[PDB]
């Protein structure tokens, strides 16, 4: 049983978002449960979170795929924002 993994959450389309740290507690078992807790934290101006992308724009489909310390782009069902809005999300 791992310790709670850390996600650096980025608000889709908010080019000034410097990232919001979020700890995935071990009880979270479904994606919708995770989306709900993430929505509470970052409150996207486009509605509750429905999609989370890693920095290679792969959609997260299961909790086991989350990487401690990785950065994630959260959308409300829209595609990722234009590239020039993604500089902070995409920086190493």
Author numbering: 148 to 239
The authors write:
TgDCX is a doublecortin-domain protein associated with the conoid fibers, a set of strongly curved non-tubular tubulin-polymers in Toxoplasma. TgDCX contains two tubulin-binding domains: a partial P25α and the DCX/doublecortin domain. Previously we reported that TgDCX is specifically localized to the conoid in Toxoplasma, and that without TgDCX, the conoid structure becomes short and disordered, invasion of host cells is severely compromised, and the parasite forms many fewer and much smaller plaques relative to wild-type Toxoplasma. TgDCX alone has the unique ability of generating short, curved, and stable tubulin-containing polymers with a consistent curvature.
